[PDB]
Structure formats: structure tokens, C-alpha cells
Amino acid sequence: TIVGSQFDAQTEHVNKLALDLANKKYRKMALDQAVLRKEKVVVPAEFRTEKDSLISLKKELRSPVYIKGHTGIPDVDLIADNRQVFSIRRRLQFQNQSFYFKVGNEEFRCTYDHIQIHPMEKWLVYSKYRRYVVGKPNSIFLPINILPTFQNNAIVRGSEIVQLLDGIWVNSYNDEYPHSIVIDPENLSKIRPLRIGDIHNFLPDGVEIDKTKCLSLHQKVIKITGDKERKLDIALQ
Amino acid sequence: MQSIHHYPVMELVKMRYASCALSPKSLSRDCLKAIHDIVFTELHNVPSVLDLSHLLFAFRHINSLKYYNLILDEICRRPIKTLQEAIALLFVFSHSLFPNYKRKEIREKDQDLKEKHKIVDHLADALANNAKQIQGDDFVRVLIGLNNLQLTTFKDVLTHIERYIIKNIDTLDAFQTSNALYGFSKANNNA
Amino acid sequence: SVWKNPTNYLPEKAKFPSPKELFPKDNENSWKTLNDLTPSLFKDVQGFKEKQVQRAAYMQIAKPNGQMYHIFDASKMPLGRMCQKIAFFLQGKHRPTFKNCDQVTYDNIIVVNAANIMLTGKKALLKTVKYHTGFVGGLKEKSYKFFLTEKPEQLVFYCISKMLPKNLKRRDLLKKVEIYRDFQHEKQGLPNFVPYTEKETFDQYFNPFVHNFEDLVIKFQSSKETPKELEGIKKEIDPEITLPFNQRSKIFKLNAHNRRVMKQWKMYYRRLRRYKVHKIKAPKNRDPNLSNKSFMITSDRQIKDFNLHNRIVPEEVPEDDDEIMRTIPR
Amino acid sequence: MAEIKAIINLRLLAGIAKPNPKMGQSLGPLGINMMHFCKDFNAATAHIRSDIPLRVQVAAKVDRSYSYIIKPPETSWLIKKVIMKEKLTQYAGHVNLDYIDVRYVYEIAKIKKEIDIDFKRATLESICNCIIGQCNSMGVNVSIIDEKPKPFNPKAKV
Amino acid sequence: MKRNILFIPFNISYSYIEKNNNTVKFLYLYNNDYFFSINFNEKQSIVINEDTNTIVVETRNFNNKINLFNNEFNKFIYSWDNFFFNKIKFTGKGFKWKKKETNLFLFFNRAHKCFFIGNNIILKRLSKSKVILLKNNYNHLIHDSILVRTIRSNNIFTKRGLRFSRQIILKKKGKT
Amino acid sequence: MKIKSALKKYCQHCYIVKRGKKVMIKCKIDPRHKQRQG
Amino acid sequence: GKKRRVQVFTGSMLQPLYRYLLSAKIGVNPLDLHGQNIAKQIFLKCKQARPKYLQNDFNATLVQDNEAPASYFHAKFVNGYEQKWYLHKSTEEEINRNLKYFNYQIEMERNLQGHDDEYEDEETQL
Amino acid sequence: LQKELYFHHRNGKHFFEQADRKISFLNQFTPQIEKVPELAETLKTILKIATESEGSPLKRAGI
RNA sequence: AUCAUUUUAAAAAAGCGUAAAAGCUUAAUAUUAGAUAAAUUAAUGUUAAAAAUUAAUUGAUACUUAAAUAAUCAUAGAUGAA
Ligand SMILES: [Mg+2]
Ligand SMILES: [Zn+2]
């Protein structure tokens, strides 16, 4: 490669730094998929008025904003610049991260729920969010992310993990909540797959499942196949 | 903000250190941009070198490189004729360096060092001529000023300090002992 | 001991043979008809902008009679704007003693320099004049290109007739209008526009012979051979011309600022193609006896009409087989 | 002249190089003498068994000159000898059935290195890793075997 | 930026002049026979080399006409004590010419006469299928050379007919 | 030539030229690719 | 796809630069920094280039001459011409137009002698 | 946070009593309550509330 | 099937080409010259160091997602601009 082979043989020992480094990142990420980073984000903005219509803003390249509130809370609707909105996506953490909005001295927590774009014109129409308050239930989306395990024996060879759900909807009642979920599927098998109640049993005290959204705890996420050769030998014979 | 122009120069610097020296910069941006814009125009009128000492120690958290040079370019013009002044620059220039992460990724080689020796070549006479004239409160700040500056040249002051402690060994304070033991330990670049 | 640029190192530079040395006994005009050189590039390129000249366009004169005179030079304003105010003055719309029921009008009109007419834009070539002549088919269109050269005077007299009120008083008015091609009118006791024949010499910009030698300076020179036609000028040779634009102190540097300016200059040259004068190119002669170019005597009738029995070589004469030369002199 | 008009890959037996008409389709229009050519081939390959098929390249030039160059035999043919099969899998990756052991790979790599001009810069791990990827495409694997095989002479098109 | 280049031949010798005011800049070419000057705006900066007799230009004015300004300036100087040249050929059976004192007689299967007559050119025959023209202006040459071409040009099927000695030729199969 | 309102480039060598209000395509290889817009 | 049938030939208009040379002599000062590398590249184009478009007796060299004022590119043409171009100030583009100022004339000299110094049309198509 | 990786822990030293000396040659920054006579009666009552209160609240501020 | 090596870099190839071969060009890339990389916000008071700084914006250039505005063209009938 970038150095001749004859010199690389002298420096073949050097490449431990290559492999010793990749230990560090990929292990760090693999265990940090779950945790929200502890870093405050802020979004200066302005109130709504009946004067500022859409198309007026959209030559000025501002954007509307919409928030849906929760039990007993009123809705709030705001104005902001487009480039704020895309920068809020451009984090890793966008699916769940808590973003604030400073109008004046006030701050309003939120989450990302979604955005609409005018498809034929392809400019930003609005940026929709969901309120978060500490002492009350709050909808969030906990994605599932499965680690690899070379410790089970069926997972290693000729079998295939099947992630039927990407995430879980829940209700959180406290400040810091987990970004995602991480699973070590060693004890799983063809005989038992994972089911949502196996997760419900293992969560913090501030979290609960939103039964209004899911179907049943007996529903299952991670499924494991049988062996391939045991099919393939039977396929030919 | 209604009476910015009624202030002298240094009575604005006191606001900078009063607010920006701790974690929240309590003031706004515009109120500091005003202070930040006035001062670097009126450097031609700050009388003393201590008045630069207060200044640099307060304005140390600036992200713009362009104005540190204005300060040091000024200090290269105003000669110093005492010894407390030179101490008052090393101890300040130590903590108030311009870090390399704020600097650009592409740059002249080792240009952080060239910012230093403009001072250290401007100081080397005074601190060397009269280092015997030295006392316990002004004593500590040199060992710190040099250790924080990563050099190996300033031995002569230290020899004049070797002779100093042993005489006053008994009359020392609890405070002047640690900084010596901590200073001489890592004198010339952790030797 | 280090890189210092030399001073006196230049070698001889090989001199090539001249056409006299190489092709004697042949037509000198070959190596004397120099390459064409369009002037219109230069005044655009090297930045000559003619000073804005502001001559007279029209004029109003009174007499102790009631009769007023209205005079116009059609080479100075456009055609329409000349023709609007005619219909506004020929009636008496500026005269506050104006009744449109008047059988009499004390307003007279004169026009001069109708050959050269101002028409803003690409209109002298494209626009047309149409009419029909009673018979089927008909519908004859004509170009301004016909009028503006052959008979431009119907045109000025044709556009007036369209702005005037369509009525019976018209003919009495148009009986009191007069047009000329020359720079004069023949009436006496009235003035005449002075024509502008001068043309700006831009000679002070590209010629030392106009300036005095003590104001000038030589910054660079090639040879030790100094012209006698240039004597009395100093020689303060720059160390700076020969430096390319990197080795100088000031470098012009593309940047968000200058590129922003670049785009302003770009629109300027597109915004000026619109303000350009177009001209009717004249008909052409193709007499081979006049041109400096070669030609053909394809047929026989081209001989008699031009009397080209001379330049044709007779048939009673030998020929030339091969004209190679091995040695090239020096 | 010295400029290269064309390059051709071929396959030849060592000492039985002979003006076969099934090679004049390539070297015919280039005006090259098959007889004068094959002479210089068989002369060099007298230290090689005659059953074996090699390959060669020919930088045919603008003046119909030539400069032949010799390379080791086809790497696939060498493994069919050890494997004692003639034809390999349609599919690959999915259908893996054949087996060699490393102790011959270490010996057939030396064949490539001792002769081929391209690998003069190369080490043996390098060469051995080249064929393993060639083995993945074929239905072949590298597994320890104590036993030896018995002789086989898999075909070649010549 | 495009930094256009002005060639100067070797027979020519030049000078560069400015005011004390430095608001005017112009340049002077001078030969045994001729002399010629031209200025430079305040927005055109200049570099010179005696090593190459080449001059380099930047333009803060961003005028695109300069690319034409070059070719005129360059060729107008090489038009002093040097020719331009061109060569013509043909290939065919019933084709020929005859040459008599810059009066070329063409016979290419046409009923009518085909005389070519050169005003202030040079024409010298090197073979039956070849003739060179020479003249100091390039623009009159092509008008002089192409008239010969228009009598017969290359067939797109066979390279039979006349052609310049340097040209893009087209070919198309026919009657395989 | 053939008058295509919607012009189109067939080969890479095709290219556009504008002479006033006139527009067209030309190719240095295939002279059948050339067009006009009318 | 589709087969071309129009064959556009561009062999006769091919005009390379180093074709009328007989020899060359690079000269180098190790004290130049702009006049070294310019001569490095030329020496490649004299040998790395193709020999068809050169003469048969073309031999290019390279020498380190500390005694020179500046690094040079000496050259010799067919019909007698000879020059030198120092390189501490110039570019590779300013050099080529000098070479054209010779190569354009040698044609005007050799064609008059009867020599066809041109290439066949079939050498390079578009 | 990045902060944990570039923070000199302030425990294990009576910092401010130590740290205020090393600057004390800078006179203009030396705080002075009695310089503000109108509020000095108020400001000082606050600091009593700080130290006298439970915990070590002011002492935990920078620490 | 998509492995592997030599290379400063080079696809069991994104395409043209061949009876099959050969041959041509892009991706990836080097030498040389010219040449874009400029402005900022928020943090732990001061002590680690032959040494190392996070989150984030705007803007110049190229690749890329693409849309919008403005002008031009987008054949015309039958007594004569209509
Ligand atoms: Mg490959
Ligand atoms: Zn095409």
C-alpha cells in the first residue's frame, strides 16, 4: 500500500496501534448507544403573532414551530430560523435529545417528533416538536440496537438475528432518561425470543410503557433462526 | 451603557474582570463588544504597564488572535525600568496564553513560541540585573511564571534564589514552602 | 553564497532570415501588407470612453408677426420624440390661444439633417412599414433600411401624420412642414445648428510624443541599444515589474469580496450590449481590380466586364515545374 | 518498432510447442513465424516437464517484432492437480466442498515467486493470501490434512 | 485568474514608460522599420521577462475581449519580417494544375475555367500534387487558400480531391 | 438537422451553440445528432 | 451500443513541441527553488514522452552546474538553431510559445526544401 | 463532558485564601465592600447567611 | 462470487470497443506551475505538560440534493398588418 512492502516488513510490528485503537471507539459507541450526553442545547427564538404569516416568513427564511403539550398544559407555537432546525437534526441524538427554546427569560423543553417539507418545492414548511415536563408523563421513542455476541454458539454460526421492531414508545417522569436500549442476546435462542415484558421488567423507576401505543407485552422483537446446513442438507436431501 | 463614554479606560477593564472572570459572563454580548471595541483603539493612552497587566489578565479569554498581538506589540514598545513590573508580566502572561486549539489548523510553524520570546527577550535584562532585590510575596510568582512557560534559560534568578531561602529559612511562612518545593521540583521543563 | 538574481547573463538570441534574404525577385507587397487590426476592440479593452457631448436638439423662434418657427435636428434625438412634439407644436397646444376650430395656424416647422437619424436599438433593421394598394395580393411591406438610406423623408412625414388628429385640418398643417437632408435650411433670417464634426483624439494616453519628456519616466528597457527618438527621459528602472505577482508585496487575491465584485463587472458588460449602436451596412462592390485579395476568373464574362486580359498569363509561354531550394541563406 | 502494438495471453506445453493452427488465429495476422517462435520457447523450457501447460505473453510490436515472456502455469490448474477434480462448482460461497492443506500452498507459492516477474517484490504471506481469495471463488478451502494425495493430470486447453 | 501572455519576437526591442504622476502607463515597440505603442489601464498590471520576450497581464476589469486583443497583438508583430505559410494538395486521376507567375491554372473535371490569381502573395510549386502559399497576413491567406479548396474538396467516402496539409479529414465507408 | 422543441444530447460530444435568438446542437462525431429549436 | 461509421481524423493537425530537437542539456543550480523543478519536468517530457514524435538522434541529459548564474534549458534544432532559456523566473507556459516560434518556422524552411514533416491522418482520431 | 478531562480538582486545598494572594499585587481587582457604603450594610448581612447556614454552601461554590 | 497482491493510486470494473482477442475513457492518483481555505459564539478563578482539547454556526471553491424567478423559442390558415 502507501509504503513499499519491503519497508512494511520492517514495520509490521507498528500496526498494533491500528487495531488497539479500534478497540476503543467501537467499544465506546457500542456501550454509549444508550446514554444521553450531558450537554445543554438552546435555541433563541420569538413568539407567534397573527401578523407573521407563512409566506412572509418564508422570504425572510424563518420557519414556524409547533408544540403539542401534555396533560393540563397549553400548546405553544413559535418562529425560528431554518438553519437552526436542520442543525438540530444534524446531531446524532435527534430522535430523543432535549432541546430548549429561549424566547426571553423563558425556556421550553421539547423533542423532535417530526418535520414537514413541501415536497414539490422542497423548502421547510414547519418544524413540529413535543413538550417535555419533568413531573408528568412524556412520549419518547427508545430505539433498539442489538450488539454482536461471539459468546453464544448458535448466533456465531449459520443463524440470523431478526429485529422486528426498531424502537419502543414509553412515558418518562424524570429529568434524565435513556437515549436507547442495548441488548446482549446470548441467553436467547430459537426456543425463546425476546418479548417486550422482558424489557418492562428491566427499566428505571421513572419509566413506564405506553400501553396505548403497543399491542401486548407478549409481542416479540428479537427472533433467531435455525441452522442453515440443517436446512441445506435437507434441501438437497 | 448610558454612560460608557464618561468612564476612563481602566474603569471599563474592571467590568471585564468583574463579569467575565467566572463561569457565566454575566453581562451581555453588546455590552462587552462595546468594551472590547473601545479598548483596543485607546491603547495609546493607558499610562502604565501594570495597567496592561490588569488588562491582559482580564482579556485572556478572547478567541480572536488579532488583538493579543496588538497588546504584545504595545508591550514591545514600552520599556520597563523596575522589577515588580517584570514579575507582574510573567505571572500574568503565564495563565493568559493563547491556546493552540483556538488557533487555526494551518499556520506558521511554532508561532505560539514566537509570541512568547517577544516578551522574554524584552524582560530578560530586568529580571536578570536585579534578582537579588526579591522578597517573599514577589518570590513565589517567578517559580510559577517560569514553570508555566516551559523554558530552561532562567537559572541566574534561581541561583540568586538559592542563596535567598537558606538565609530566611526559619522566618518563612507555611505558604512559601510548598510553592518552592513544588517549583524547584519541575524547574527546567520538569527537570 | 545564497540565491541572488543575476544581472548580466543574457545570451545572444538567434536571428531569423528575412523575406528579402529568402525570397528576392518577388512581390514586395507580400511582406508589407500587415495583419488586420480592429480598432473597435481597443477603445473597449484599454478603456477609452468618449466625453459626453451635449449638442442642441431643437429650438423655438418667434417673430414680430404671429408666426413662430420650430426647428429640429433629427441626428440628435430619436425619431418618435421628435415627432411627438411636432404634433404638439404644429397645432398650438403650447399656444394658450388655441381653438381646435381654427382655420388658420401661425406655427411653422423645419427639419434638417434627415439623412442621419437616431433610432435607439435594433429597430432600423427589423421594423417595417406596411400598406395596401387596392388590388388583391398587395400588402406591401417595406423596411426602414429603404427609407433611412434612399428616401428618409416620407418616414418623418409619415409618422407625424399618425400622431396628428385624424381630421380635415391635417392637410393644412402638413402643408407647413419642411425637411432637409443637408445640415442647412434655405430660409434666411433664421439660425442653423452647427454640426459636430470633431472626433476625440485619445493620443495623450498611448503616445509620448504628445507629452513633454521631463514629465515621463522609463521603468524598463530591453536592449543596451537606446533609441535616439527617446532622449531626455530618466531611467529609474523598477525592481518590481519583472517580479511575478507572487513575489510582490501586494497580491490580488480572489476572495468572497472580490468575487462579489467580479459578478458586478460581469453584469456591467451584459448590461451594455443593450446600449449599442447598430448601423445599416452599405451595399458592396466586388471589383477584383480594387481589392488586395486574390480571386477567380471562373468564366469569360468576368474578363470583359473588368478588362482582365492583362493579369491572365498568355498561353504562349513556358511554365514552372518545381521550385525547391536546398540551402537557406543567413 | 519498439512501440507495443498488442499483448496476448497464451497457454503452451513446455517442450511440445509446435505450430498448432489453433494458435495462428492470434499470431497469424501479425506475421510472426510460429516455427521460429516455438523454437525459442522449447529451448528455454527444457528444464521443465513436458506434460505441464504453462502460459506466456507476447508484446507484439508495430514492425511485427516480438518479445515473448514466460510465466508460471495457471494457478487454478495447479490446485485441480492436488484436489484430483477437473471441474469445480457453478456457485461459490454457498457450495464449499473441496479441501487443501497449507503445506502444499507454501510449496506452490514458491512456484509463482521463483518465476513470475510481478512477485519479485513480494513476500509469501502476500502470495498465499492471493490464492485464498481465488479459492473463495471456486469452492475451495484450506484445512489441515495429514495424508498425501495421489497423482492426477487435469486437463488444459493448450 | 487567467493571466494572458503576450509574446514578442526576437527581432523586436521594446521599452516601458510611465509618468511621474504614475496615472499613465504605456509601452513602445521599435524595430529597424516600424514602431508601435499601446497603453495599459490603471487596472491592468503587468510582468515582463527578457528571458522569454513574454509579458503577462492581469485585469481587474474582467473584460473578456482581451483574449482577442492578444491574437491581434501577437500576430501583428510577427507580421513584421516574417511570413505566414500554408500548403495545399490533391489526390486523383484526371487532376492537374499549371503554374505561371502567381497565376494557377486548375483542371478538376469542370466545364468552365478555374483560374486562380494572387494579388500580393507568393506561390511556389514543389511538386505536381503540392503547392505552398506565403503572405504576411493570415486572414487574406485563408481567403486565398480556401478558394482553391472549394473547387473540389475531400469526398467523405474517399480521400480523393484537394485538401490542406493540416486539417480534420472525414471518412465514411463505401462499396465494401 | 431536425427541429426538436425539446432539444436533447445523444452523445457526450454533443454541445450547444447560440447565434442570437437561434439555438441548436452540434456534434463533432455524428453529424446526425444536430438539431434546432423551432 | 451503436457503432461509429463516421471516422474523424486528426493526425495532420497534431503538433507536438519537442519534435524538431536534436539534443538538450538541462542545467541545475541547487540554489534555485523555482528554476530546478521546472527543469525536472522538462527532462521527463523529453524521455518519458513518446519517441515517434521525436527525432531518432534525440539525446537529453541533465547536469548539476553550481557555477551557472541560473538553471538553464539549452536546446538545439535541426536546421541550425540554438538557444538557452534560464528558468529562475519563467514558467513552463512561457517556454512553449518560444518553442512554437521555432517549430512554426522550421516547417516554413523544410517544406520549401520539399520535406514532408507531417503525420498521417490515421494516427489520432477524436 | 470534556470538563472532567481538563479539570484540576479544587478539593484538598483552601483555594481562595491561597489564590487571592498570588493576584493581590493587582490592586484594582481587590474587592472592597466598604467602597459601596450604601449597600454594605445589606451585602454583609447576606454573607452571614451564607456561612452560618447548614452545609458549607459558599464553600462548595467553586469547589 | 466481489477475494487478494504489487503500487504514490488504480473498480473480478461505471461505459464504448472485439467473431473471441487486442485497443480507447472515466472513478481512484502523482510530478510541476498557477491557486480558494475567511469571519465568529458558549465553558471549570491559577497551574497538567519534552505532548493532547469538546458542542456549534456563517461564508469562498468543487462534488451533491434540488427548487424558484426573468427573458427567448414552443407552425399556421384562406378579400388585406388584423
Ligand atoms: Mg482486477
Ligand atoms: Zn453528437
Q: What is the DSSP string of B134-146?
A: --HHHHHHHHHHH
CA of C88 to C1' of I71 (A): 36
Cross-chain residue pair C324–G81, CB shorter than 8 Å: no
| CA of F34 relative to ligand 2 center, distance in Å | 7
Query: Which residues contact residue B191 at a Cβ distance below 8 angstroms, ignoring those fewer than 6 apart?
Result: B152
Query: Which residues contact residue F30 at a Cβ distance below 8 angstroms, ignoring those fewer than 6 apart?
Result: F10, F11, F13, G4, G6
Q: Find, in chain F, the residue whose alpha carbon is nearest to that of G126.
A: F29
* Chain G hits for D5, Cβ within 8 Å: none
Q: How far apart are CA A133 and CA C251, in angstroms?
A: 59
Resolution in A: 3.7
If you count residue pairs, one on D and one on G, with CB atoms under 8 Å apart, how many are there? 4
Cross-chain residue pair E168–G6, CB shorter than 8 Å: no
Q: How far apart are CA B5 and CA A232, in angstroms?
A: 89
Amino acid at C242: T
What is the residue whose three cell numbers read 428618409? C152
Contact between chain E and chain D (3 or more Cβ pairs less than 8 Å apart) = no
Q: Find, in chain B, the residue whose alpha carbon is nearest to that of H14.
A: B175
CA of C256 to C1' of I59 (A): 8
Please check whether residue D35 touches G, CB under 8 A: no
Q: Give the Cβ contact number of residue C85 at 10 Å.
A: 17
Pairing of strands D68-71, E44-49: unpaired
Please check whether residue B57 touches H, CB under 8 A: yes
* Chain A hits for D126, Cβ within 8 Å: 5
Q: How far apart are CA A57 and CA A46, in angstroms?
A: 12
Q: Which CA distances in Å does B34 have to A49, B12, B15, B18, B51?
A: 33, 10, 12, 16, 19
Cross-chain residue pair G8–E83, CB shorter than 8 Å: no
- The three three-digit cell numbers of residue D115, written as one number: 518465476
If you count residue pairs, one on A and one on D, with CB atoms under 8 Å apart, how many are there? 7
- The three three-digit cell numbers of residue C307, written as one number: 478588362
Q: Find, in chain G, the residue whose alpha carbon is nearest to that of C242.
A: G89
Q: Are E11 and G105 in contact (CB under 8 A)?
A: no
Phi and psi at H47, nearest 5°, equal: -70, -30
Please check whether residue C314 touches G, CB under 8 A: no
Strand partners, E162: E90
User: Residue G31: which of C2, C13, C326 has the nearest Cβ?
Assistant: C2
* Chain C hits for E120, Cβ within 8 Å: 27, 29-30, 33, 292
CA of C45 to C1' of I71 (A): 28
CA of C253 to C1' of I36 (A): 9
Helix (H) or strand (E) run with residue A200 in it: helix A196-200
Q: How far apart are CA C254 and CA C146, in angstroms?
A: 52
* Chain G hits for F29, Cβ within 8 Å: 4, 6, 8, 126
Question: Burial of G85 by CB count in 10 Å (0-12 exposed, 13-18 middle, 19+ buried)?
Answer: buried
* Chain C hits for G84, Cβ within 8 Å: 11
Q: Give the Cβ contact number of residue C220 at 10 Å.
A: 20
What is the residue whose three cell numbers read 482579556? B59
The 8-class DSSP code of residue E72 comes to H
| CA of E170 relative to ligand 2 center, distance in Å | 15
Q: How far apart are CA H30 and CA H24, in angstroms?
A: 7
- The three three-digit cell numbers of residue C316, written as one number: 504562349
Query: Which residues contact residue C56 at a Cβ distance below 8 angstroms, ignoring those fewer than 6 apart?
Result: C73, C76, C193
Q: How far apart are CA E118 and CA C33, in angstroms?
A: 14
Phi and psi at E175, nearest 5°, equal: 60, 65
Distance linking the first and last C-alpha atoms of chain A: 47
- The three three-digit cell numbers of residue B120, written as one number: 522574554
| CA of D104 relative to ligand 1 center, distance in Å | 26
Query: Which of C103-109's residues contact partners 24+ apart within 8 Å by CB, and which partners?
Result: C103/C172, C105/C172, C105/C173, C105/C176, C106/C65, C106/C66, C106/C67, C106/C68, C107/C67, C107/C68, C107/C70, C107/C176, C108/C67, C108/C68, C108/C69, C108/C70, C108/C176, C109/C69, C109/C70, C109/C71, C109/C72, C109/C176, C109/C177, C109/C178
What is the residue whose three cell numbers read 545564497? C2
Closest to A130 measured CA to CA, from A76, A169, A198:
A76
Tell me if F27 is assigned to a ligand binding site.
yes
CA of G41 to C1' of I31 (A): 7
| Nearest DNA or RNA nucleotide to A4 (CA to C1') | I7
Query: Which residues contact residue G99 at a Cβ distance below 8 angstroms, ignoring those fewer than 6 apart?
Result: G17, G18
CA of C224 to C1' of I26 (A): 55
Query: Which residues contact residue C230 at a Cβ distance below 8 angstroms, ignoring those fewer than 6 apart?
Result: C208, C218, E15, E28
The 8-class DSSP code of residue A44 comes to B
3-class state of residue A206 by DSSP: coil
Closest to C141 measured CA to CA, from C153, C150, C132:
C132
3-class state of residue E13 by DSSP: strand
Amino acid at B177: T
Q: What is the dihedral of CA D85, D86, D88, D90, to 10 degrees?
A: -140
Contact between chain G and chain C (3 or more Cβ pairs less than 8 Å apart) = yes
Cross-chain residue pair C245–E45, CB shorter than 8 Å: yes
Q: Are G95 and G101 in contact (CB under 8 A)?
A: no
Q: Are E53 and G95 in contact (CB under 8 A)?
A: no
Cross-chain residue pair G70–C326, CB shorter than 8 Å: no
Q: Give the Cβ contact number of residue D149 at 10 Å.
A: 13
Q: Are C16 and E11 in contact (CB under 8 A)?
A: yes
| Nearest DNA or RNA nucleotide to C131 (CA to C1') | I81
What is the residue whose three cell numbers read 427639419? C111
Output the DSSP codes for A208-233. Answer: EE-TTTS--TT-B-EEE---SHHHHH
| Nearest DNA or RNA nucleotide to A2 (CA to C1') | I8
- The three three-digit cell numbers of residue C74, written as one number: 433629427
Q: What number of helices (H) and strands (E) belong to chain D?
A: 5, 3
Please check whether residue F31 touches G, CB under 8 A: yes
Q: How was this structure determined?
A: cryo-EM
CA of F36 to C1' of I14 (A): 31
Q: How far apart are CA H11 and CA H63, in angstroms?
A: 6
* Chain A hits for D122, Cβ within 8 Å: 5
| CA of F25 relative to ligand 2 center, distance in Å | 8
Q: How far apart are CA D46 and CA D50, in angstroms?
A: 8
Output the DSSP codes for chain B. Answer: -TTSTTS-SHHHHHHHHHHHTSSS--S-SHHHHHHHHHHTTGGGS---SHHHHHHHHHSTT---SHHHHHHHHHHTTS---SSHHHHHHHHHHHHT---TTTS-SS-STTHHHHHHHHHHHHHHHHHHHS-SS--HHHHHHHHHHHHTT--S---HHHHHHHHHHHHTSSS--SHHHHHHHHHGGGTTTT-
Strand partners, F23: F18
| CA of F23 relative to ligand 2 center, distance in Å | 15
Cross-chain residue pair C297–E117, CB shorter than 8 Å: yes
Q: Which CA distances in Å does E119 have to B158, C39, D93, E78, E163?
A: 99, 25, 82, 21, 22
Please check whether residue B91 touches H, CB under 8 A: yes
How many degrees, rounded to 5, is the angle at CA B164 between CA B158 and CA B170? 135
Strand partners, C61: C69
Please check whether residue A236 touches D, CB under 8 A: no
Distance linking the first and last C-alpha atoms of chain B: 51
Contact between chain D and chain A (3 or more Cβ pairs less than 8 Å apart) = yes
Q: How far apart are CA G61 and CA G58, in angstroms?
A: 10
Please check whether residue E7 touches C, CB under 8 A: no
Q: How far apart are CA E109 and CA G64, in angstroms?
A: 64
Please check whether residue G4 touches F, CB under 8 A: yes
Closest to D119 measured CA to CA, from D72, D79, D69:
D72
Q: How far apart are CA D58 and CA D54, in angstroms?
A: 14
The 8-class DSSP code of residue D142 comes to B
Tell me if F12 is assigned to a ligand binding site.
no
For chain D, the chains sharing at least 3 beta-carbon pairs closer than 8 angstroms are: A, G
Q: How far apart are CA G2 and CA C76, in angstroms?
A: 63
Closest to C31 measured CA to CA, from A108, G120, A198, E122:
E122
What is the residue whose three cell numbers read 417530526? A114
Amino acid at H47: L
| Nearest DNA or RNA nucleotide to B21 (CA to C1') | I45
Radius of gyration of chain G (CA): 17
Q: G14: distance to nearest CA of chain D, Å?
A: 19
Phi and psi at C234, nearest 5°, equal: -70, 175
Interhelix angle B10-20/B50-58, rounded to 10 degrees, is: 30
User: Residue C3: which of G32, G86, G113 has the nearest Cβ?
Assistant: G32
Q: What is the dihedral of CA C185, C188, C191, C196, to 10 degrees?
A: 40
Strand partners, A78: A47, A65
Best interface-test mutation with C: which of G73, G113, G116 has the largest number of C CBs within 10 A? G113
- Listed in order, strand segments (DSSP E) in C133-275 are 140-143, 177-178, 216-221, 234-235
What is the residue whose three cell numbers read 448590461? C271
Q: Which CA distances in Å does C264 have to C257, C258, E40, E61, G96?
A: 11, 10, 22, 10, 35
Closest to B172 measured CA to CA, from B148, B130, B132, B140:
B140
